[PDB]
Symmetry: C4
Subunit: 388 residues, 4 copies
């Protein structure tokens, strides 16, 4: 049982093939399911696990009312094997209203954040025990990735941000070894605002496509060297921009170094990855609202901020159906590292007033070298008929 | 952990002994059980699993209305250990409205089909990761076995069909190594229409008894050659024929190479297997609708299309109770390979109107060289008393 | 892994200490619990498992009505780890309205009987596969232990009976190796009528204490030589008798060789085992119906039919609460073989009319060489308050 | 598989970081959850489990009325992995209205106590089998820790008590090897009343901080030597006292050798451990009720009975929210033994009269050598809306 090095070439990708769906909300209309948001997927060397931030309630439960609030003391990080819905026998791995997790090849690491808005604690749990913890540094809603962290040769990296959701905030990259924070680097380079990174192994370092909640509707890239703890940052060149909200396809623009100052305020967790000078990326179909989800390859979109040339569009979720967050994760094949992605399908408040609650289901696709068709895999539930 | 070969002779069979019963519908009247159809059974070297395509819903649930619909974005392949009903902690192992699984002696392969009717994706998931995928090739419902695939020396074979359900169609046989498609042989031989193949190992090959939905109420046999990827095909010779609908024993006839053209349109998944020049097989008792289930040996049924000589009839489900699909699976003993079979006990729509859902339960019987008696093991739910 | 020889002396036993209690019925007034009966405990070399025969329904279910019927085609053998109640997650191992199970030290064998009254089938399932089966031999309810079998050097043995519940019947002892019936020895010796043996290892052989449903309220003993397959049989000498119904303490008598001819009709499954020339035994407290449960030692109970000298009484279930079936199982310590017993606590029909169903819970005790006190541990459910 | 000896230094401790929350009551508002009390956490070498005392019922369940009663024949010890809440799949591991548990590195010991008030039995269950038992020695509610025991080089140790709750009483220290009571020392030294010890491994021996139900608001300390079986005892010097009820922080006083005689009668289980001459300790925030919960360090709190200088306070549960029992457990790190604690959050009767039941949820913190913020993590259930 050795540490993961991720030192294989990236797999060829022609687009994505369906992988998993949990049907969470449809199951809750007739069963006991955890209320959740901020879901994500991560895998040990054998199998993939699904993760979410619980609201310390099930759905057909009085405590469901007001689960739109995203920081309560009852939020726990749930962990099942992938495709096992979050039923009552699901294990709550830590107290977290914000988190991240990764397996280094030997054990699970879990970065968990709970407490008061202005004085939060982040806990680091490795191989089933608490190993370290750190205070909020800027005393303003300390938060992390909401998707998998990445470990290389024993060292795990995680990007955390404390500070304003709409001005310069303070972002750090922690390097954890077996639960212990061994080094902390601060954000450097040109990305002006970073949130909810979707990171992946790009041997010999780590790459992150994040969220800019301030001036940018293009996406910040962050590049972590694991050996000397140096950090560079920039933006996803691509003329077609990953964030929501944003400008429409014709109107939009980007920039390889700065935020585009286009609709920038607010955002969503999303992902992207290089393919030579091309970029594979997903996004909500609608530019303003979290409806629908699509993916495509942008030719020259990693190095040309003028490129708007998309090939291989797939609809994952049709524009009439709600979506949400999304993030990457990497699965090691025999010869190559695959990239896969999960999409959050949010139902309930405040967009939908049919119910009093707010939760999600997920859907998961993995890259493929093979061939694929079409279809739309949305959440499914009829809220007109749900509990109360 | 070595690759399975099934390089053992087929065990003596004097009939079938009772093996397993999930009591799924009766349980779901006072419990939370998945709605499902197209159930099946495959075993790793240790123990047996039950599979079904779920309907992304439980039974006592608003979402269970109209579950008669065969293909939806919400259908997932379920997998419990055999005997474990489909409760909420059941793993969904992939997105699928048609599927097939098998174990190569090292890990599970799952062949999963989901998507648009005219543009469907088949994802190939091996050892808990996605290895390959293919588009629909003839853009008319890409479909597969709905029972176990078969692996020999870590080369797994699966039969897939795309095209009309009542005319010539495009059948291919795939050869999957560690989740990777290494070859696609197209169907050759004298079989005119092939669906839902119940395959089993027959060292050094694989043999399938399928469903002809077009002209034949006999059953196609497809012989796969694992080493040089060649394919021959024909029909099961026996005069008492496998399909439903069909005509009574007095009027029915067969042919070793062609569809019988006797009430051949429409069908049902079923199974058969050779014993020297004799045939073991099961089928519905009612000739036209899927009521009852029975199993027998036809003497010279494997080779002599005039033979109508059955010895060893067992009622499995009596004539007055609903059955459905049924398939073979194989189990390796100390000395030899046993053959077993399950039976889908379909309840609900469109045949029964007391309820709005369509679901199933199952019963499994296994080969025995010992003795046995009689009995009938139906589903046994009272639908008059179920969820409004 | 190695086969169990049980080649260690019986532990010193001063009485019994509390071990396990499942609270089945009480939990079912607010949970989804299986309707069961004919429970029992058996242990693999690490931990113990509980078994019962389910009714194809949960308690809060419409199908729970009339579960006083012992033989339905919906009855499956359930297997959970000891002290895990029979929830919807529970595995059904085989179809059975009668069973026996044991672990040879490498795998589980289960002996499962289902089918028609006049033509039942016994299945022999070993290491998760069906390996043999036998037909009812006298066409009158083929039935077996309803508790653990015993395996010595990988040769397991089990006692089955076919024929009258109130007359001579045909009892046979099967020797099973790796699921395969290698021998069948018919009952021999002075035992006149024999049902539901509570068997235990007693190196170099096995011993059973059974239920005479015909002409004895004393209990049959059967001995089984594992190497030569010979069978001797008699009765539990003790003038204090173990079956129920029976005559009261002052009136009763016994015979080392013959049924006592005392209220001898009917019976109840129960157990005894020898400690030198003394006899440890449990029985219902009330002589004529299945109320309460007690245990004691009879001085000279094993070699004196006129002995009525009890020491070491413990009340397991008090005379106002319902008991039922009860059986032995054995557990290997470092230096000795402990003997333990379970007690079925039945509730519902026919004796209790406040509910429509018939189910049970269990309490379990284990032999102790230490000291102990006193208590009553009944079912504890409130029928006047159960699902109406 | 070697035995644990804990021969490693106590980790640097700056205070506590959040580890786990179970959210149990909130879930039983829409889920089938066990009624519990007296919970606690212990860990094997890999991972942590959570135990609590069931009431032989779930919450939404008519049997939950009256569960303020602490000793019933339906009380069983529960054992899930930590953060997996007590759903219907939870293993009851023994009969017990009082218990302790610990893993010695190879297997689990459970010390389980049930039976009559005046004649309790304590069963000792190791590696999945019953190895011993004792009767109550003074015939007045025999009782043990309700938290982990401690094992060293294969010798485990537990503190037990029999006798008056409000006068002198009979406390013993049992030493257990592989489930066998190998020695019994009786309580010695300054401590006058010893209940519910929270014990930890302080190489080469064991240390416990207990509850004095009689004359003390300061907390008994009991040193256990594991090699020569010697017992000394005293009280927690610190002038800030650990028990509830107590006098306030201005009025209170302690004493290193004797109870303090201050509002002393009654109590609550709690914990403390030494840090050189300082004392880390927790306690309720309210002096006379089990409202709130706080932890702090007292400088010179382990030697100076005049010292009232607290540093590093944390609020675990705010003053207006309920708590209850709280105890310690210890976790072996790479280099050091860490100390963690759990806090029982009791809800319901007789304090809260909106509901008929009495149950609890739980929070768990672990020692950290890093930094932390603040917060509060109460039960958070809404009894005004709960069941009936
Ligand atoms: C079965 O499923 C497959 C795979 O999902 C479908 O094939 C895909 O079709 C999509 C969408 O039409 C393709 O993505 C598109 O690529 C265009 C490229 O245009 C041409 O140029 C290349 C040369 O580089 C030629 O090889 C090729 O023949 C193309 O004609 C882009 O320009 C498209 O972007 C524009 O259209 C989308 C969608 O309408 C807009 O939203 C965008 O904003 C933009 O204006 C688009 O990305 C994809 O590449 C195909 N995949 C594969 C693997 O071939 C089948 O069409 C489908 N069959 C059926 C019946 O549904
Ligand atoms: C207890 O359980 C056993 C085993 O399950 C039952 O015995 C089986 O009974 C079935 C049904 O009768 C037997 O199967 C039948 O075989 C017939 C063979 O014909 C003859 O030839 C052989 C020698 O070559 C003789 O041994 C035999 O006596 C016959 O004279 C077929 O003719 C039957 O098919 C026809 O009957 C059925 C209706 O039963 C129709 O629906 C068919 O369409 C067809 O016309 C049938 O296949 C089977 O062989 C027996 N198995 C064994 C191992 O003996 C017992 O009957 C049962 N006991 C009780 C009391 O129920
Ligand atoms: C705390 O817990 C312990 C252990 O459970 C109890 O001690 C047991 O008590 C029982 C019942 O009282 C004892 O079992 C009885 O033994 C009797 C033997 O009688 C005496 O005579 C012989 C020979 O002269 C002496 O050798 C021996 O020392 C005895 O003093 C039997 O006569 C009893 O059977 C008769 O009475 C019962 C009711 O008790 C009837 O129902 C029977 O049918 C019959 O008439 C019985 O077998 C047992 O031996 C004790 N166990 C141990 C290990 O010592 C404590 O009493 C209990 N304490 C409290 C306060 O409850
Ligand atoms: C974010 O979270 C951190 C960590 O939880 C908080 O820092 C802790 O704050 C608490 C509360 O004030 C501190 O606990 C207190 O320690 C005092 C020690 O006094 C001094 O100690 C030395 C030398 O004198 C100096 O370093 C320091 O400046 C202190 O002034 C005790 O005196 C306190 O006890 C009294 O307070 C409580 C009520 O608050 C009473 O009920 C007590 O009985 C008693 O009268 C108290 O114990 C704690 O030490 C801090 N820990 C650390 C590691 O710094 C931050 O406060 C928080 N930040 C924000 C903005 O909320
Ligand atoms: C059960 O559903 C039927 C049919 O519903 C169809 O399938 C659903 C999943 C969804 O796609 C619906 O829009 C479809 O109608 C319901 O009966 C239909 O109701 C519609 C609108 O109310 C009406 O126009 C038609 O009469 C019905 N459609 C068909 C095809 O028959 C019905 O409401 C449900 N029954 C109950 C008792 O709830
Ligand atoms: C295999 C089987 O059915 N066993 C029964 C058992 C046997 O019938 C008994 O050993 C005689 O052979 O009887 C049990 O019967 C209970 C139930 O059955 C009616 O037939 C009876 O007349 C009623 O009074 C009623 O109690 C038993 O527990 O004694 C159950 C067991 O399943
Ligand atoms: C073994 C047992 O019953 N332990 C109790 C414990 C003991 O009574 C204590 O150690 C003193 O010997 O007390 C606890 O009980 C609280 C409960 O007690 C009733 O008798 C009384 O009516 C009320 O005070 C009621 O709250 C305790 O929490 O202190 C719990 C534990 O189960
Ligand atoms: C830790 C945390 O609170 N995360 C929350 C984010 C952050 O506020 C943004 O990252 C702003 O920085 O906003 C959400 O409403 C959202 O967009 O879905 C909910 C999510 O739970
Ligand atoms: C892939 C798919 O949809 N299969 C469906 C089949 C096909 O229509 C037949 O193979 C004819 O092509 O028909 C069913 O109604 C049936 O017969 O039970 C259900 C099943 O789900
Ligand atoms: C997009 O941009 C602007 C909205 O600011 C609008 O005027 C224009 O019509 C839109 N173009 C398209 C192609 O939708
Ligand atoms: C986004 O939603 C609005 C409706 O609120 C719609 O007008 C707009 O065109 C949508 N964008 C797309 C691409 O459909
Ligand atoms: C399986 O394939 C290998 C090739 O690597 C071959 O050498 C081996 O003998 C094959 N198995 C059998 C039974 O022929
Ligand atoms: C035993 O039962 C008989 C009734 O048949 C009765 O004569 C006798 O009194 C009973 N003995 C006792 C001790 O109750
Ligand atoms: C035996 O059981 C019946 C049940 O109704 C009861 O009436 C009778 O009194 C009991 N006998 C004894 C001796 O307890
Ligand atoms: C604490 O309460 C007691 C009541 O006996 C009293 O001595 C003291 O004044 C109180 N302390 C404070 C600070 O009010
Ligand atoms: C303790 O709890 C009681 C009950 O509500 C409350 O009245 C009292 O004020 C509390 N004491 C303190 C010191 O907060
Ligand atoms: Ca329910
Ligand atoms: Ca933005
Ligand atoms: Ca046909
Ligand atoms: Ca009798
Ligand atoms: Ca006190």
């Amino acid at each position: 049982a050795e540490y993961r090095n991720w030192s294989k070439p990236q797999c060829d990708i022609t687009g994505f093939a369906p992988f998993s769906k949990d049907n969470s909300i449809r199951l809750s209309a007739g069963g006991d399911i955890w209320v959740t948001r901020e879901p994500y997927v991560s895998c040990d060397p054998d199998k993939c696990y699904q993760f979410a931030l619980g609201q310390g309630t099930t759905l057909n439960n009085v405590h469901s009312n007001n689960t739109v609030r995203g920081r309560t003391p009852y939020r726990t990080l749930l962990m099942n094997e992938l495709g096992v819905p979050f039923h009552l026998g699901t294990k709550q791995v830590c107290i977290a209203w914000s988190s991240s997790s990764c397996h280094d090849g030997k054990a699970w690491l879990h970065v968990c954040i709970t407490g008061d808005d202005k004085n939060a604690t982040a806990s680091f749990i490795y191989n089933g025990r608490l190993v370290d913890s750190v205070v909020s540094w800027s005393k303003e809603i300390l938060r992390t990735q909401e998707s998998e962290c990445v470990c290389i040769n024993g060292t795990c990296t995680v990007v955390m941000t404390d500070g304003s959701a709409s001005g310069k905030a303070d972002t750090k990259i922690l390097f954890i070894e077996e639960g212990k924070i061994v080094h902390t680097s601060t954000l450097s380079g040109s990305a002006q605002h970073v949130e909810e990174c979707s990171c992946y192994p790009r041997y010999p370092g780590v790459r992150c496509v994040c969220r800019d909640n301030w001036k940018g509707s293009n996406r910040p890239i962050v590049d972590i060297n694991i050996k000397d703890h140096s950090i560079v940052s920039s933006y996803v060149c691509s003329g077609l921009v990953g964030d929501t909200p944003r400008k429409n396809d014709s109107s939009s623009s980007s920039h390889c170094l700065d935020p585009n100052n286009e609709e920038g305020g607010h955002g969503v967790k999303g992902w992207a990855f290089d393919d030579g000078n091309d970029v594979w990326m997903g996004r909500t179909i609608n530019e303003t609202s979290r409806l629908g989800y699509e993916t495509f390859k942008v030719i020259e979109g990693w190095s040309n901020p003028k490129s708007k040339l998309q090939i291989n569009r797939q609809v994952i979720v049709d524009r009439g159906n709600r979506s949400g967050y999304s993030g990457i994760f990497s699965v090691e094949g025999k010869s190559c590292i695959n990239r896969c992605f999960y999409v959050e399908l949010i139902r309930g408040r405040k967009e939908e007033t049919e119910v009093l609650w707010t939760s999600n289901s997920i859907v998961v696709f993995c890259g493929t070298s093979g061939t694929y068709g079409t279809g739309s895999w949305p959440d499914g539930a009829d809220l007109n008929l749900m509990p109360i």
